[PDB]
């Protein structure tokens, strides 16, 4: 069969599915808001963050990058990261964790913890 | 530092970067075209395919799914897959291979071969 989902891209944070130690999640940040911070790390999981729409700013270990549709970040395990919505529409992202970072309640696994 | 790229989302196929045995690639399929087929497999790499924009159809081991922005497929290693553009605008996708499937010339690695 096919392992498939159409992301609604309207959830603050929603864990989607996994396959062989990669896990997908949706994260949509409202205008004027941010997720993570200068002390926000996943000690054992890389996070591949892709911007589907909107405008924002990533700070990754003190390095700053403007975000737009098409922006891709490979956030290595252990790197502090913050994602800020700097526009006036939702900042829509899809995220790939390797290995997985979150349990079925959307709580961090040991690998997803700081 | 930050491992970052803004995808142009206008290349038929462009390998992007890797981190710790996950590799990203852009694939944009022109109207009336298709990539892969009923015999198209990566024997040793899963492929996570995400649709950024456009409209299409995936066939994965004979299973059919309409594709739109937000569509996510986890195409397991060994699964036959074909992606057809069924609209009249480009079908823009980003792809995550685990383990990596392609070398620096965009040719399949052993894991990316059928
Ligand atoms: Zn602090
Ligand atoms: Zn994170
Ligand atoms: Zn490292
Ligand atoms: Zn792995
Ligand atoms: Zn055939
Ligand atoms: Zn493929
Ligand atoms: Zn399997």
Residue numbers in the entry:
A (entry chain A), B (entry chain A): 0 to 113
Direct quotes from the study:
XcTcmJ was crystallized in a monoclinic space group (C2) in the presence of zinc acetate and the structure was determined to 1.6 Å resolution. The final model is comprised of a protein monomer (residues 1–113 and Gly0 from the TEV protease cleavage site), four zinc ions, two acetate molecules and 151 water molecules in the asymmetric unit. The active-site zinc is within co­ordination distance of the side-chain NE2 atoms of two histidines (His41 and His80) and the carboxamide O atom of Gln46. A bound acetate was also identified in an ∼5 Å deep hydrophobic pocket and was most likely acquired from the crystallization solution. A bound water molecule, acetate and three side-chain ligands indicate octahedral coordination to the bound zinc. Thus, the octahedral coordination geometry and coordinating water molecule both suggest a likely functional role for the bound zinc. XC5357 was crystallized in a triclinic form without zinc, whereas XcTcmJ crystallized in a monoclinic space group in the presence of zinc acetate. The conserved His41 is located in one of the loops and the backbone rearrangements in XcTcmJ result in His41 relocating by ∼8 Å to coordinate with the Zn atom near the center of the cupin barrel. Comparison of the solvent-accessible surfaces (see supplementary material) indicates that a deep surface cavity is eliminated upon the conformational rearrangements arising from the binding of zinc acetate. Furthermore, a new channel is formed on the surface of XcTcmJ that is surrounded by nonpolar residues including Ala11, Phe12, Val27 and Ile28 that may reflect the natural substrate-binding site.
The tcmJ gene of Xanthomonas cam­pestris pv. campestris strain ATCC 33913 encodes a protein from the cupin superfamily, XcTcmJ, with a molecular weight of 12.2 kDa (residues 1–113) and a calculated isoelectric point of 4.9. XcTcmJ is among several gene products from X. campestris that have been annotated as being involved in tetracenomycin polyketide biosynthesis. XcTcmJ belongs to the cupin superfamily, the members of which have a conserved β-barrel fold and have been classified into at least 18 functional classes involved in a range of biochemical processes, including plant growth and development. The crystallographic packing of XcTcmJ indicates that a homodimer is the biologically relevant form.
